[PDB]
Design a protein around this ligand. Structure first.
Ligand SMILES: *O[C@H]1[C@H](O[C@H]2O[C@H]([C@@H](O)CO[C@H]3O[C@H]([C@@H](O)CO)[C@@H](O)[C@H](O)[C@@H]3O)[C@@H](O*)[C@H](O)[C@@H]2O)[C@H](O)[C@@H](O[C@H]2[C@@H]([C@H](O)CO)O[C@@](OC[C@H]3O[C@@H](OC[C@H]4O[C@H](O)[C@H](N)[C@@H](O)[C@@H]4O)[C@H](N)[C@@H](O)[C@@H]3O)(C(=O)O)C[C@H]2O[C@]2(C(=O)O)C[C@@H](O)[C@@H](O)[C@@H]([C@H](O)CO)O2)O[C@@H]1[C@@H](O)CO
Ligand SMILES: *O[C@H]1[C@H](O[C@H]2O[C@H]([C@@H](O)CO[C@H]3O[C@H]([C@@H](O)CO)[C@@H](O)[C@H](O)[C@@H]3O)[C@@H](O*)[C@H](O)[C@@H]2O)[C@H](O)[C@@H](O[C@H]2[C@@H]([C@H](O)CO)O[C@@](OC[C@H]3O[C@@H](OC[C@H]4O[C@H](O)[C@H](N)[C@@H](O)[C@@H]4O)[C@H](N)[C@@H](O)[C@@H]3O)(C(=O)O)C[C@H]2O[C@]2(C(=O)O)C[C@@H](O)[C@@H](O)[C@@H]([C@H](O)CO)O2)O[C@@H]1[C@@H](O)CO
Ligand SMILES: *[C@@H]1O[C@H](CO)[C@@H](O[C@@H]2O[C@H](CO)[C@@H](O)[C@H](O)[C@H]2NC(C)=O)[C@H](O)[C@H]1NC(C)=O
Ligand SMILES: *[C@@H]1O[C@H](CO)[C@@H](O[C@@H]2O[C@H](CO)[C@@H](O)[C@H](O)[C@H]2NC(C)=O)[C@H](O)[C@H]1NC(C)=O
Ligand SMILES: *[C@@H]1O[C@H](CO)[C@@H](O[C@@H]2O[C@H](CO)[C@@H](O)[C@H](O)[C@H]2NC(C)=O)[C@H](O)[C@H]1NC(C)=O
Ligand SMILES: *[C@@H]1O[C@H](CO)[C@@H](O[C@@H]2O[C@H](CO)[C@@H](O)[C@H](O)[C@H]2NC(C)=O)[C@H](O)[C@H]1NC(C)=O
Ligand SMILES: CCCCCCCCCCC[C@@H](O)CC(=O)O
Ligand SMILES: CCCCCCCCCCC[C@@H](O)CC(=O)O
Ligand SMILES: CCCCCCCCCCC[C@@H](O)CC(=O)O
Ligand SMILES: CCCCCCCCCCC[C@@H](O)CC(=O)O
Ligand SMILES: *[C@@H]1O[C@H](CO)[C@@H](O)[C@H](O)[C@H]1NC(C)=O
Ligand SMILES: *[C@@H]1O[C@H](CO)[C@@H](O)[C@H](O)[C@H]1NC(C)=O
Ligand SMILES: *[C@@H]1O[C@H](CO)[C@@H](O)[C@H](O)[C@H]1NC(C)=O
Ligand SMILES: *[C@@H]1O[C@H](CO)[C@@H](O)[C@H](O)[C@H]1NC(C)=O
Ligand SMILES: *[C@@H]1O[C@H](CO)[C@@H](O)[C@H](O)[C@H]1NC(C)=O
Ligand SMILES: *[C@@H]1O[C@H](CO)[C@@H](O)[C@H](O)[C@H]1NC(C)=O
Ligand SMILES: *[C@@H]1O[C@H](CO)[C@@H](O)[C@H](O)[C@H]1NC(C)=O
Ligand SMILES: *[C@@H]1O[C@H](CO)[C@@H](O)[C@H](O)[C@H]1NC(C)=O
Ligand SMILES: [Mg+2]
Ligand SMILES: [Mg+2]
Lengths: 601, 140, 601, 140
């Protein structure tokens, strides 16, 4: 059994161990077996029998040259078979007989030259068939595709198809219901016979890096005419042959197609115009551009009927002045470009993610910044500086707001959140805030979560700023260099359940403030510098308090604090990882669990 | 000790007292009266300083219903070819001017606001005057 | 003597104490006397005699109605006389006789109606004469101005002059040397007779808020034709009557003037163009715009011969794309506008102040950002985010660099200062740096000052990052949350003199690391949390160490630390403010100077 | 234990060893050879992974003459319609690709640089391979 037992009686990975023959010294209950990178080279009849209850079989790169009739005859439960990278020469007419439950068949780079003779026509349960990186030249789907009634995914990418003739799709004309997601990327396409796709319906179609010239692309997209796709994905690969031009006509053909969601995934050419270029996708409901340079675009004002717009990893320079009236959700993230946000005007906007762009806002937050009054979600995390100068006038409905990791300024200069009466989630962790106004959170009634880790307070004393946050159920307050603490702080947080106070600078754990935390269940206090206890009223810990981390500190293990070091032992039914509560003061006795000391005085 | 009444709008009521020893008189008119929901008008002042207005600046100590906001330094007159003409004013010069103002964009709680406005000016710079503004706000 | 004695035997301020007559109960040595806001009302002969050694006299707002012959007859040393705000009715022909040393005469708002009869023609030592806020209607300078050979400053602002005729300046045509700085602001000017200024020479001329319309302005500036001014200041006041238009022709006239330095100080109108507007000041060497809106300007590319350009307190929006080839110094500060810097191209630039603009740089710092390789001074303090991605390639000559108060990023990601072999000053205080690379300062050989207060270090342990900074003579390291300390740190800083370690988080003052600080003279260690001393090798304090602040801490005043609390007393010849070294541990003995304790054990 | 030699330029000398248990072979060519003063060329790789390249990413541990720089997470393949074609690669698929690169703008000290490049990918994500690069730099 040089194999590795990942999940006893269940999952074994005998990968690359020079097996010339299938192991047998393994349990019968086995459901997942990986026999990758082993020189099997001959898959004969009933090769697998030692595993009648198998569900997943990985035969990746096993030099398998010939599979005979009924090699997996006894695998009725097998749903996934992976044969990636095998130099197949002979494939028996009934090699896949017995897999009455096969849903996923992976035959990538298996020397497969034609879909015509692939013996799978009886696997009715087949959901996805991956045959990418093979020698297929024709797109003519076999007749047996009829019996394949549960097929949803077909990967024909990286093959040798060069043209699509009408007759190739004849099989589909006879399968009404047929949620097929097709990938034809990296096939040297150069001709799709006109009218070949008339009344054909795909759920998804991906054609990336298929066409040689712009003219070859426009020609093929014409043969695509009449198609109905739910989601269509075009574009190319960064590490392969790209188009030398992509002018305002490249996408003309899409006008004679019925598309619901569109996505252009990576284009080397620097876009010039955006309105003449995409007006055939105007009726589209979801529009996406990932990794495309749009610096050269002067007008971002056209009113497309798009409802979801997603721009990720694009180079832009000046911030796009969007004025899409029907748009409801906008995802503008991880874009390498400028560093200055400017107003947008999205009257219908409800979801707004503008995170990870290094953007800087010179005046937050108002409805005049976005042009909407229906915003419910707002994510401006991971950006540059965000100066607060308006307490969300017009954004009353915000339920979610994330400023995480963005330098925020003017926080304690007035009540910036005064209008957010419905805000439920709020993360301002590591936003370099310096709380210095006890009205910092006024307005946040409905608030339930509040992550303000990584910051700091004036004088390092935690004031009474939570007195209005009733439904408050979570509250991170770690890394805030807190030292002192107002005893009346948490006193109104009845529903509060968790309360992080980790990695701070406390030296004396207390227990009075937590007296009224009815629902309090968790209370992290780790990575601090506690050891003392300036008040032995150590009984005031809520009746529901289950967990109470106190791991890693600088305890005082000298009789000097026998009174407090004992209380720790007294209730080790609330603590956590005790093998990490090592002592710190005895230069001779350090590293021994505090819940194990000779209390000899 | 006397409280002076500036004006009332529909949002607020503004008045002031002194917070300094010497209580040199000032004339303060606001037209129209300030509205915390956003307003813009002319602020007419008449004063005769006891120091030079050279490099003037207010230190502001605002207070929201018992709550305290950090100090605020607002500069009027940086010191060279300034925006306002009254910066040039000398120790005993009559200052009869009209300053325009405007603002908008912030929602304030309901309640009592008090703002101590300590004015400072001069080359070695010493206090000019101290006033404590009491402004009552009733929203909606 | 209800007066206030500011500087004994030297300066007294008897302001506003109801004096109806000049005091006498004051010393003879008095040099500065303030008798402002007192009802004198009658200045008779030899009114001041009790003060023969007076240099400065303030009679501001004293209801003085009449001054008679020889009122200050015995004040030969008086150089400054202030009579601001006095309702003068009668001014004796020889009222100012005796002031053989008067340099400054202030007669602002003194009911003065004509410069003609003002009896000052004999005060040859007069440097400046301020007669602003008065009833003067003519600009015709009196004949006695000849004897006034040391006059450099004349303030005629806020008067009633409405026109300037040629004959008015005839006096000047007869004073070759004459460094006169004139202010005519707030005078309702509307006509300056052509050719009136031919061959006239002023050092400075200020004409702010003088003209009613644009046409009235253009007309006057024409009469100004032929003038030679060193510095000319135009513009208006924010709280007074402004011009309704300021188009490309407003400044045509300046082309027939000889100007060395120009400044437009505050203009209500929003500028449209900048190149057609100021081409008459193209030969000017110093160009300035304070408080003027330039948003509406599309081209900032013209090549003016300006050598110094100063833009302060202007509204701009998009960052000005400056391409001034001859410019050597650029001061662009406190501008309310955009938040994104873009490249400039100033080949001759040597001084560069771009502080306090809230600007954000996305890739600092290279020569391609400024277009120069002669930059010696660079101030980018008080701005937004500044991402480091280039270690000053091409800015080798930087001697001064101030990033103070600007969020800096990518500091510990490589040696950002590697090229600054000549940098002498460096302030990165409160730039939110988190030192985590012991090569953070490589390249900074010549460095002499280093202010890195307000930041933080990885693990709060101070590494060996100063080993290359030889000539280093100053080093602020306060507020950096420092706790531990590498003993080899400062070991190479032989020339180091000061060393701030204030407001940190040290608990145990040491003395080993400072062993080799030859030149060390100062060593602040205040506002910490020291009390212990984990090594009684308290003798290793440099031989030159003079001062050693240790004020305000949390000392341990219990016999437990008799060994260390004693060492403090032992050398109170190095300490500082001892009345602020209060104890902290005895809940009964706290607040008593540590250099005063009953060491009873 | 064998050290493999990638190439030499006029700025540097690049070589690598393995830092992981299993030492699956890789083909690495750089044309032209990297120049720390700034260069741009093609990086040809040939590999046959033992995991899926799905959501690949390197963890970089750089070292400058004994000095240590923070960890660096560099992502190749975010996971959906990725830039590179090799992201789609499966467990036993042959990966013969050519990636283009380019860079400029940073001055490096003289000395020995070592960069541990731990590659990670897969849905549950586990290490793919670990390589330790030794690059000698001689400026001027
Ligand atoms: O939306 C833009 C705005 O564009 C619009 O205005 C253009 C034009 O009308 C501007 O001025 C002309 O008109 C005025 C006067 O007749 C107006 O009644 C005249 O006196 C001027 O000389 C001039 O001829 C119009 O053509 C456009 O189509 C647009 O409608 C502007 O581009 C700009 O303007 C604002 C400021 C400017 O920032 C100063 O350089 O100028 C005005 O104000 C002076 C006033 O400003 C106060 O500060 C404003 C805010 O600053 C920070 O964010 C503070 N934290 C915040 O509290 C302040 O609210 C300052 N406090 C006062 O003391 C100053 O005296 C001006 O010249 O009148 C206008 C001002 O815009 C606003 C305003 O934001 O307050 C907005 C305007 O839409 C309008 O509602 C005016 C009112 O008419 C004033 O009574 O008030 O910027 C804005 C925005 O981009 C800002 O984000
Ligand atoms: O100065 C601008 C720059 O304008 C100039 O270039 C225009 C045009 O030539 C751009 O590309 C065309 O040409 C290339 C090729 O033929 C060039 O030989 C072709 O393949 C393209 O499809 C396209 O047709 C020209 O028309 C203009 O007049 C100007 O001369 C550009 O606007 C821009 O360009 C840079 C990037 C771009 O940012 C990516 O969206 O694109 C190029 O690079 C890809 C390459 O980028 C590398 O990253 C660059 C830096 O990024 C950060 O700052 C990192 N911290 C830093 O380390 C990097 O140095 C990435 N690492 C590689 O893996 C990517 O493959 C490109 O498409 O070729 C060009 C690039 O500009 C530069 C460069 O900065 O490296 C500068 C150019 O002037 C030029 O010198 C090229 C070399 O020819 C490349 O061999 O290199 O932005 C810059 C600046 O504003 C940046 O601040
Ligand atoms: C409290 O906050 C700390 C950090 O401030 C959290 O720490 C993480 O905890 C996980 C699991 O214990 C570790 O694997 C991570 O390395 C820690 N990293 C972080 C985020 O610092 C801690 O999980 C928080 N506890 C609660 C209950 O919220
Ligand atoms: C201290 O103990 C708490 C409570 O057990 C830990 O909190 C868990 O943190 C993980 C983060 O990986 C969360 O996913 C869990 O929900 C938390 N567990 C629960 C329910 O309490 C916390 O990680 C510990 N802090 C330390 C020392 O790392
Ligand atoms: C060391 O740095 C501290 C800053 O942390 C300086 O402290 C300030 O000292 C002045 C004295 O003129 C006080 O008025 C400020 O209030 C102090 N700021 C703080 C810490 O609150 C200190 O001056 C520096 N010491 C030296 C020698 O320059
Ligand atoms: C500790 O004492 C030093 C002097 O012994 C104080 O330093 C002075 O600080 C002021 C204001 O920053 C400077 O103008 C002086 O030049 C400093 N004196 C010198 C030469 O050291 C320091 O402020 C004190 N620390 C505190 C905050 O109490
Ligand atoms: C000292 C008496 C002061 C009376 C002050 C009324 C001040 C109004 C507050 C300005 C508020 C923000 O909305 C401005 C912008 O944005
Ligand atoms: C409960 C509200 C208390 C409000 C005190 C408000 C003080 C005014 C701050 C204005 C913010 C500016 O920075 C923006 C401009 O300029
Ligand atoms: C793991 C082996 C890596 C060999 C890497 C050579 C990398 C060159 C450093 C890129 C440097 C910056 O100049 C980029 C920008 O700006
Ligand atoms: C002594 C020099 C050691 C250098 C290690 C350099 C690591 C490369 C950091 C590149 C900085 C990028 O953030 C900018 C782009 O992208
Ligand atoms: C369809 O598949 C069944 C087995 O599932 C097979 O018996 C039948 O021959 C197939 N139909 C044809 C003739 O294509
Ligand atoms: C099939 O279509 C349904 C909706 O018609 C969708 O929920 C499902 O994800 C699709 N399956 C795929 C990925 O082909
Ligand atoms: C939380 O408080 C809000 C206050 O508006 C209330 O509407 C809501 O019902 C509370 N959450 C619940 C359902 O407990
Ligand atoms: C203040 O100036 C106005 C405007 O010129 C003038 O009408 C008024 O008389 C002056 N007020 C007083 C009485 O000082
Ligand atoms: C000039 O000054 C002298 C002082 O000696 C005085 O006697 C004479 O009257 C003055 N004459 C003029 C030019 O006013
Ligand atoms: C007089 O001119 C000189 C140089 O021309 C200048 O330095 C000086 O400031 C001027 N007079 C004064 C002190 O204003
Ligand atoms: C300061 O150091 C520089 C080199 O960094 C050296 O040229 C110079 O002589 C030093 N100054 C003195 C006199 O110590
Ligand atoms: C690698 O790919 C190239 C380009 O297609 C091809 O010529 C060669 O046969 C392949 N060789 C390798 C390294 O397997
Ligand atoms: Mg390219
Ligand atoms: Mg105005």
């Amino acid at each position: 059994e040089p194999c590795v037992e990942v999940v006893p009686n269940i999952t074994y990975q005998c990968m690359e161990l020079n097996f010339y023959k299938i192991p047998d010294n393994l349990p019968f209950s086995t459901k997942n077996l990986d026999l990758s990178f082993n020189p099997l080279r001959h898959l004969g009849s009933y090769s697998f029998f030692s595993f009648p209850e198998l569900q997943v079989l990985d035969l990746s790169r096993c030099e398998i040259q010939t599979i005979e009739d009924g090699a997996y005859q006894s695998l009725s439960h097998l749903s996934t078979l992976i044969l990636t990278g095998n130099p197949i020469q002979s494939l028996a007419l009934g090699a896949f007989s017995g897999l009455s439950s096969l849903q996923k068949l992976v035959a990538v780079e298996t020397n497969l030259a034609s879909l015509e003779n692939f013996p799978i026509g009886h696997l009715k349960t087949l959901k996805e068939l991956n045959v990418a990186h093979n020698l297929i030249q024709s797109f003519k789907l076999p007749e047996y595709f009829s019996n394949l009634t549960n097929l949803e995914h077909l990967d024909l990418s990286s093959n040798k198809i060069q043209s699509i003739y009408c007759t190739d799709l004849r099989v589909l004309h006879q399968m009404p219901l047929l949620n097929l997601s097709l990938d034809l990327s990296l096939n040297p396409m150069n001709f799709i016979q006109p009218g070949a796709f008339k009344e054909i319906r795909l759920h998804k179609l991906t054609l990336r890096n298929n066409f040689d010239s712009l003219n070859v692309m426009k020609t093929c997209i014409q043969g695509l005419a009449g198609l109905e796709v739910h989601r269509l994905v075009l574009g190319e690969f960064r590490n392969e042959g790209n188009l030398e031009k992509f002018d305002k006509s490249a996408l003309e053909g899409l006008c004679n197609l019925t598309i619901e969601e569109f996505r252009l995934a990576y284009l080397d050419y620097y876009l010039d115009d955006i309105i003449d270029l995409f007006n055939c996708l105007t009726n589209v409901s979801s529009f996406s551009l990932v990794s495309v340079t749009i610096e050269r675009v002067k007008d971002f004002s056209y009113n497309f009927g798009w409802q979801h717009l997603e721009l990720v990893n694009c180079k832009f320079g000046q911030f796009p002045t969007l004025k899409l009236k029907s748009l409801k959700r906008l995802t503008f993230t991880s874009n390498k470009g400028g560093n200055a946000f400017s107003e947008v005007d999205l009257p219908s906007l409800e979801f707004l993610d503008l995170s990870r762009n290094g953007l800087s806002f010179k005046g937050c937050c108002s409805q005049s910044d976005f042009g909407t009054t229906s915003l419910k979600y707002l994510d401006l995390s991971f950006n540059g500086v965000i100066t607060m100068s308006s307490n969300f006038l017009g954004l009353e409905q915000l339920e979610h707001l994330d400023f995480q990791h963005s330098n925020l300024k003017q926080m304690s200069e007035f009540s910036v959140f005064l209008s957010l009466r419905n805000l439920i989630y709020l993360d301002i962790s590591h936003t370099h805030t310096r709380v210095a106004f006890n009205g910092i959170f006024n307005g946040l009634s409905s608030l339930e979560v509040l992550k303000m880790a990584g910051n700091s307070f004036q004088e390092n004393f935690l004031p009474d700023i939570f007195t209005e946050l009733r439904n408050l159920t979570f509250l991170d307050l770690s890394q805030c260099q807190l030292e002192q603490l107002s005893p009346t702080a948490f006193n109104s947080l009845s529903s509060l359940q968790v309360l992080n106070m980790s990695h701070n600078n406390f030296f004396s754990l207390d227990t009075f403030p937590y007296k009224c935390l009815n629902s309090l269940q968790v209370l992290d206090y780790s990575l601090n510098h506690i050891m003392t206890s300036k008040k032995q009223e150590l009984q005031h810990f809520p009746s529901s308090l289950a967990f109470l981390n106190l791991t890693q500190n600088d305890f005082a293990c000298t009789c000097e604090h026998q009174s407090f070091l004992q209380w720790i032992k007294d209730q080790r039914q609330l603590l956590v990882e005790v093998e990490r509560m090592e002592c710190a003061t005895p230069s001779d006795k350090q590293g021994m669990p505090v819940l194990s000391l000779n209390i000899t005085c | 000790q006397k409280q002076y009444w500036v004006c009332n709008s529909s949002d607020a009521s503004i008045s002031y007292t002194y917070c300094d020893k010497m209580q040199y008189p000032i004339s303060i008119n606001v037209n129209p009266c300030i509205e915390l929901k956003g307003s813009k008008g002319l602020l007419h002042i008449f004063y005769i300083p006891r120091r030079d207005l050279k490099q003037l600046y207010f230190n502001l100590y605002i207070t929201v219903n018992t709550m305290n906001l950090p100090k605020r330094k607002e500069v009027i007159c940086r010191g060279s070819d300034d925006d306002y003409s009254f910066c040039r004013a000398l120790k005993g010069e009559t200052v009869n001017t009209t300053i325009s103002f405007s603002f908008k964009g912030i929602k304030f709680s309901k309640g009592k606001y008090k703002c101590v406005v300590e004015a400072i000016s001069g080359s070695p710079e010493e206090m000019l005057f101290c006033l404590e503004f009491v402004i009552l706000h009733q929203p909606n």
